[PDB]
Amino acid sequence: LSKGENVPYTFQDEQVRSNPYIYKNHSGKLVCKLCNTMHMSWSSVERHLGGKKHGLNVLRRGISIEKXXXXXXXXXXXXXXXXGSVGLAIQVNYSSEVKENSVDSDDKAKVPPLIRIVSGLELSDTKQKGKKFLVIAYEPFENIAIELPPNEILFSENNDMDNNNDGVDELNKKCTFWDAISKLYYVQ
Amino acid sequence: KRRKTEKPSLSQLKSQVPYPQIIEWYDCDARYPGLLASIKCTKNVIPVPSHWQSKKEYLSGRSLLGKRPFELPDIIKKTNIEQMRSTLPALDLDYKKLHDVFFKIGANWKPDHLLCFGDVYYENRNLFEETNWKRMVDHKRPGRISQELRAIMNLPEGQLPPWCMKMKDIGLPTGYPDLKIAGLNWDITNLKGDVYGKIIPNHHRNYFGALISFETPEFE
Amino acid sequence: ICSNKVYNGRRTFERHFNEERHIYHLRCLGIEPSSVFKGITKIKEAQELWKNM
Amino acid sequence: NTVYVGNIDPRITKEQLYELFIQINPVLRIKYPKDKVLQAYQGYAFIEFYNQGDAQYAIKIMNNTVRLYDRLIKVRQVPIAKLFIKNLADSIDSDQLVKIFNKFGKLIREPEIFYLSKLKCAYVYFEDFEKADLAIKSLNNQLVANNRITVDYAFKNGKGNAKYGDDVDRLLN
RNA sequence: GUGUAGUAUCUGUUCUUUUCAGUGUAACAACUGAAAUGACCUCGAGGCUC
RNA sequence: UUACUAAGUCUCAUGUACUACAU
């Protein structure tokens, strides 16, 4: 059952071993140095190797081994209404190929204007606050804001049928249009 | 049922106790816990050895496999019967020799370890390592380094340890204010062998029972 | 005392008595560490025990 | 008190460690493990001194000093608010979370962004149960980045119990 | 160098009705009795659920 | 830098000793 292999004694001061684990101590018995278990016969040794106990100690031993031009554009606010409530609509116009003739290197040129709702709680001056602003931004031109005293207007409920191209946010895809051919940004 | 659920909390029991840290969770089911806390926490009582509540019959010990068979007390080993009879896998002896070994040589002799008032031997314990420990706290003292650890350290003779330089900037050991070391507080010319320094004590009978003579009973 | 935490063994809970977080709850609670408070379970009782200390 | 020691040759023995460190300070105890999988020494020890003064002293003088078997000897010295927040916007960066919760309370660690169900959720660690109560009071069922977020306590069942205010108060103290 | 009966000890193997109540236990363990069926929600856990 | 603890019960096999009893 030993398959003719020679297992040297533990005290013989270590030829490569099949398993460098099972040894024979000062006595004739066979032992697993990791498991610290004594085994009478080579059959018992093979039961030990095929047993889950030895394997667990092998995994434990492996774990031990591992151990900006700012130019104000022109806005055109206008009180709108549909059905069934009231909403706001803004018409922002941009340059007429006047200065955009020097910059055309596909650097976010494909990116349309972006809007975000900002709380006045944070300002460069920090004096008064308590209302929101519908900020609109484009790379070269300067940012623009619109005060929204009303807690909620035109804040709709599942307008479209839940299609998921987040773009920037639900606000932008939900209610903005960018006439890039004429350079007119509508928001409502 | 009701008596089992009537039990006070162990922390409620701690307050009654002058030495609360001995009481343990199982003392809650003590049938007389207020009394058992007083007895167990009384001055000189020695708590029950804790090998109870284990089913291992007090010795399953893995350490028991590796215990030495026996070692003769060196005084008896002097008697040379070790060589006369080989116990490991006729020797004529003298009556005066053996008798003197027990009496003349071995009257004052006593085992080195023994144990103390409350020493109790738990399964995993082995006294021998603590014997070499106590003996070692005796022999080994700071300022001296054996030649073996010196060779492993690779420190040649006449050269100070590497912590003498960091000890020059940091200062003498807080634990050893009286320690002296060659080259710093102590004369480098007195550097000899394995001792690079020694503690200099700044401190500088009959016990009513002094026998003043020692006479053992003679066999002859 | 620990997050009303659950333990699956009594040996393990007996090991909780010496632990980083358990001692953090004690010491940060104002109940100083080590061996007098070992048998603690609820936060309340060891407070009067620490007043006894 | 107790010092860790490492990068030790298994041929270094217990008496050799003792004789080594007694040169530095008095040594109360030495725990020097002995492997039950290799029947030798795993090459790191623990030396408990009589106080953290001698401990720290030995840490200073001993570190990177003694050379044993050509290998150098190393010496090294040896509970907060958590809010679950659900339905976050995909445009919400972890740093943006940091900015949002800083105004309410100091964060002991950084938020943890994870996805349930698709559903963006995060764990936010506050140093104070009361500041956590502030971020809850103001930020519960609120619309940020055009998305309604829910702010409550994370499970442990959930944080915020009566003993939780009591002990978290103490950990603050 | 055998047979009858019987014993002890390794090792391998494996986890027995989900729960409740009683006995029991230092606590376990173990033993003794019964039995939900249906619907729903979030990530095997959870329900002042019906 | 890993801060020191695992087997138990059952089942069906193997390992090894042993106790009365007969040629």
Sequence-separated (6 or more) residues with CB below 8 Å from residue D108: D80, D81, D125, D126, D127
Sequence-separated (6 or more) residues with CB below 8 Å from residue D39: A10, A33, A36
SS (H, E, C) chain D: CEEEEECCCCCCCHHHHHHHHCCCCCEEEEECCCCCCCCCCCCCEEEEECCHHHHHHHHHHHCCCCEECCEECEEEECCCEEEEEECCCCCCCHHHHHHHHHCCCCECCCCEEEEECCEEEEEEEECCHHHHHHHHHHHCCEEECCEEEEEEECECCECCCHHHHHHHHHHHC
3-state secondary structure of B174: coil
Quick one: D87 and D169 in the same domain? Answer: yes
Radius of gyration of chain B (CA): 28
The total number of structural domains in chain D stands at 2
DSSP character at residue A85: B
Alpha helices in B118-204 (DSSP H): 127-139, 147-153, 163-170
**Is A57 part of the contact surface with chain D (CB cutoff 8 Å)?**
yes
Q: With contact defined as beta carbons under 8 Å apart, do A134 and A117 qualify? A: yes
- Of B20, B8, B13, D166, whose CA–CA distance to C37 is shortest? B20
Q: With contact defined as beta carbons under 8 Å apart, do C35 and B22 qualify? A: no
Q: ∠ CA B72-B73-B78 to the nearest 5 degrees?
A: 85
Place of tokens 């006070």: B8
Quick one: D165 and D95 in the same domain? Answer: yes
**Is B143 part of the contact surface with chain D (CB cutoff 8 Å)?**
yes
DSSP character at residue A23: E
Amino acid at A17: R
Quick one: D137 and D172 in the same domain? Answer: yes
CB pair distance less than 8 Å for C43 and D167: yes
Q: How was this structure determined?
A: cryo-EM
Among D167, D172, D173, the strongest candidate for a mutation testing the C interface, having the largest count of C CBs within 10 A, is D167
Count how many Cα atoms sit within 13 Å of the Cα of residue D23 in the half-sphere of its side chain: 27
Residue of C nearest to B9 (CA): C45
DSSP letters spanning A9-21: BGGG-----SSS-
Q: With contact defined as beta carbons under 8 Å apart, do C52 and B15 qualify? A: yes
Q: With contact defined as beta carbons under 8 Å apart, do A1 and A43 qualify? A: yes
Burial of D100 (0-12, 13-18, 19+ CB in 10 A): middle
CB within 8 Å of chain B, chain C residues 1-53: 35-36, 38-42, 45-46, 48-49, 52
Quick one: D73 and D86 in the same domain? Answer: no
Domain boundary among D78, D100, D124: D78
Domain boundary among D45, D78, D111: D78
**Is D167 part of the contact surface with chain C (CB cutoff 8 Å)?**
yes
Among C13, C34, C52, the strongest candidate for a mutation testing the B interface, having the largest count of B CBs within 10 A, is C52
Sequence-separated (6 or more) residues with CB below 8 Å from residue C27: C33
CB pair distance less than 8 Å for B15 and C39: no
**CA–CA distance from B106 to each of A148, B94, C38 (Å)?**
105, 16, 48
Tokens at residue B73, please? 């007390």
Q: Which long-range contacts (C-beta less than 8 Å, at least 24 apart) are formed by A108-113?
A: A108/A139, A111/A139, A112/A178, A112/A180, A112/A185, A113/A137, A113/A138, A113/A178, A113/A185
Q: Which long-range contacts (C-beta less than 8 Å, at least 24 apart) are formed by A81-85?
A: A85/A153, A85/A154
* Chain breaks in chain B following residues, C–N > 2.5 Å: 89, 204
Beta bridge partners of D68: D71
B99 backbone dihedrals φ, ψ, rounded to 5°: -55, -45
Quick one: D67 and D147 in the same domain? Answer: no
Quick one: D162 and D88 in the same domain? Answer: yes
Quick one: D9 and D61 in the same domain? Answer: yes
| Phi-psi map region of B206: left, alpha, beta (phi>0 left; psi -120 to 50 alpha) | left
- State how far the Cα of C38 lies from the Cα of B11, in Å rounded to an integer: 10
- State how far the Cα of A145 lies from the Cα of A124, in Å rounded to an integer: 14
- Of C30, C23, B30, whose CA–CA distance to B10 is shortest? B30
- State how far the Cα of D108 lies from the Cα of D79, in Å rounded to an integer: 10
Touching subunits of B (3+ CB pairs, under 8 Å) are: C, D
Beta bridge partners of B114: none
Q: With contact defined as beta carbons under 8 Å apart, do B194 and B147 qualify? A: yes
Sequence-separated (6 or more) residues with CB below 8 Å from residue B178: B199, B200, B201, B202
Domain boundary among D49, D78, D107: D78
Amino acid at D66: V
Q: What is the resolution of this structure in A?
A: 5.9
- State how far the Cα of B143 lies from the Cα of D22, in Å rounded to an integer: 9
- Strands D27-31 and D45-49, sheet pairing: antiparallel
DSSP character at residue B105: I
Handedness of CA C26, C28, C29, C31 (dihedral sign): positive
Q: With contact defined as beta carbons under 8 Å apart, do C39 and B24 qualify? A: yes
How many contacts, defined by CB atoms under 8 Å, are there between B and C?
A: 26
Quick one: D122 and D53 in the same domain? Answer: no
- State how far the Cα of D134 lies from the Cα of D149, in Å rounded to an integer: 15
DSSP letters spanning A95-155: --SSSTTS--S-SSTTPPPEEEEEETT--SS------EEEEEE-SSSPPB--EE-SS-SS-
What residues in D contact B141, CB-CB < 8 Å?
Answer: 22
**How close, in Å, is residue D141 to chain C by CA atoms?**
27
Quick one: D95 and D171 in the same domain? Answer: yes
- Of A179, A158, A176, whose CA–CA distance to A167 is shortest? A176
Tokens at residue C31, please? 């109940």
Tokens at residue D77, please? 């010295």
- State how far the Cα of A178 lies from the Cα of A185, in Å rounded to an integer: 5
Q: How far apart, in Å, do the first and last CA atoms of chain C sit?
A: 19
Burial of D129 (0-12, 13-18, 19+ CB in 10 A): buried
Minimal Cβ distance to A33: which of D38, D91, D147: D38
Count how many Cα atoms sit within 13 Å of the Cα of residue D50 in the half-sphere of its side chain: 11
- State how far the Cα of B33 lies from the Cα of B35, in Å rounded to an integer: 5
**CA–CA distance from D114 to each of A95, A140, B129, B135, D140 (Å)?**
43, 36, 54, 61, 19
Place of tokens 């623990």: D46
**CA–CA distance from A50 to each of A16, A44, A58, D46 (Å)?**
21, 10, 12, 37
H or E element that contains A179: strand A176-179
- State how far the Cα of C34 lies from the Cα of C38, in Å rounded to an integer: 7
Tokens at residue B68, please? 């030495």
Quick one: D85 and D162 in the same domain? Answer: yes
Alpha helices in B16-60 (DSSP H): 33-40
**CA–CA distance from B86 to each of A138, B78, B82 (Å)?**
102, 15, 6
Q: With contact defined as beta carbons under 8 Å apart, do A26 and A11 qualify? A: yes
Quick one: D97 and D155 in the same domain? Answer: yes
- State how far the Cα of A113 lies from the Cα of B22, in Å rounded to an integer: 75
Exposure string of A91-100, with b = 16+ CB inside 10 Å and e = fewer, is ebebeeeeee
- State how far the Cα of D63 lies from the Cα of D77, in Å rounded to an integer: 11
Q: With contact defined as beta carbons under 8 Å apart, do D134 and D89 qualify? A: no
Could you tell me the residue range of the domain that residue D124 belongs to?
A: 79-173
Residues D163, D165, D171, D173: what is their CA dihedral angle, to the nearest 10 degrees?
-120
- State how far the Cα of A118 lies from the Cα of A132, in Å rounded to an integer: 6
DSSP character at residue A174: H
- State how far the Cα of D151 lies from the Cα of D134, in Å rounded to an integer: 11
Quick one: D61 and D90 in the same domain? Answer: no
Number of residues in chain A = 188
Q: With contact defined as beta carbons under 8 Å apart, do D77 and D110 qualify? A: no
Q: How far apart, in Å, do the first and last CA atoms of chain D sit?
A: 26
Sequence-separated (6 or more) residues with CB below 8 Å from residue D17: D5, D8, D30, D32, D45, D47
Q: With contact defined as beta carbons under 8 Å apart, do B76 and B100 qualify? A: no
Amino acid at D99: K
H or E element that contains A56: helix A52-66
Place of tokens 């340890």: B161
- State how far the Cα of A89 lies from the Cα of A94, in Å rounded to an integer: 17
CB pair distance less than 8 Å for B167 and D65: no
Beta bridge partners of D84: D123, D152
Sequence-separated (6 or more) residues with CB below 8 Å from residue B160: B181, B182, B183, B191, B196
